[PDB]
């Protein structure tokens, strides 16, 4: 079933962002993206610039799995999202929330 990969990604995302974990990546901020119903490539190309931290590897793996072409970030209609800076926690929480909404909406891919 197609609704298995998305559920596994949601489980991984909620498992890496739980409050028992230390501050994710310890302060290194991440450029936000436009919530445009299919930000898979956007999230991939905006988290591609997090050097290590050893805690968001599987997340990037599954994201690249959902976006195999890894289209360049130049698709954004405004690079201002690549100019505003927010910590990893806020961006990953917003991504998790929007992905939960998309999963509840039946939209898997």
């Amino acid at each position, epitope marked *: 079933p197609p609704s298995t990969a998305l559920r596994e990604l949601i489980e991984e995302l909620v498992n890496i962002t739980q409050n028992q974990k*230390a501050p994710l*990546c*310890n302060g*290194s901020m991440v450029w936000s993206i436009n919530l445009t119903a299919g930000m898979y490539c956007a999230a991939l190309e905006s*988290l*591609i*610039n*997090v*050097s*290590g*931290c*050893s*805690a968001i*590897e599987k997340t*990037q*793996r*599954m994201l*690249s*799995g959902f976006c*195999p072409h890894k289209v360049s970030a130049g698709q954004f209609s405004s690079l201002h999202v690549r100019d505003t800076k927010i910590e990893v926690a806020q961006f990953v929480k917003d991504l998790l929330l929007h992905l939960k909404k998309l999963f509840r909406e039946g939209q898997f891919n």
Partner: antibody
Amino acid sequence: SSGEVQLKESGPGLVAPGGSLSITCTVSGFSLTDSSINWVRQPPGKGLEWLGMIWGDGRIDYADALKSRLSISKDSSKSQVFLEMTSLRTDDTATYYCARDGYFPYAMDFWGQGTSVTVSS
Amino acid sequence: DIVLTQSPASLAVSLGQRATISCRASESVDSYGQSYMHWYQQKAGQPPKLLIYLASNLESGVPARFSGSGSRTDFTLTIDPVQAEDAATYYCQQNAEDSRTFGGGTKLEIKG
């Protein structure tokens, strides 16, 4: 101009069999909190063999072969990463590199020169 | 731990030909539609250098001779043509698990 990313290595080349071998790779230009360093090894003439790694968050990995006799640690203040080894046999004679991992998919991009290590008598 | 074998362990090919260095894996290495295989180039007394990441994506500052392919079990490093400065031992390496493991090495040189 000099001043590139310095993958500097520091460690004694000769130790007695059975001692505690220690190597200290020094890296300048950035901090260990935003990068990860690996410990690749290469016996003379033989092939490479991964022997551990350490991330900027605090995770430490070891190869399943030498997971017991090996230990890794880091120090972001000194900007250096340690290495230990127990019961050094003569086969352990090999060059010890220390490479830097780039971004996703976290392959190896930078490479130092490596300090030599020999154990004969 | 996963082990990686190569064929041949050492290779000597003259200029103008097409290189073919295969790296066989004990099991499958792909994960979520992508395979986590790599290559490296080590010269005499020189440190390694990344050549191809994900076994299908070339690195910057790499000649067009380099080529990578494979489907979850095999990975061939294709260099064409064969040049003298390309005579350096290569090492296929995977990071698809918690413990990486380099291949068996493949020394390359020019024959005759």
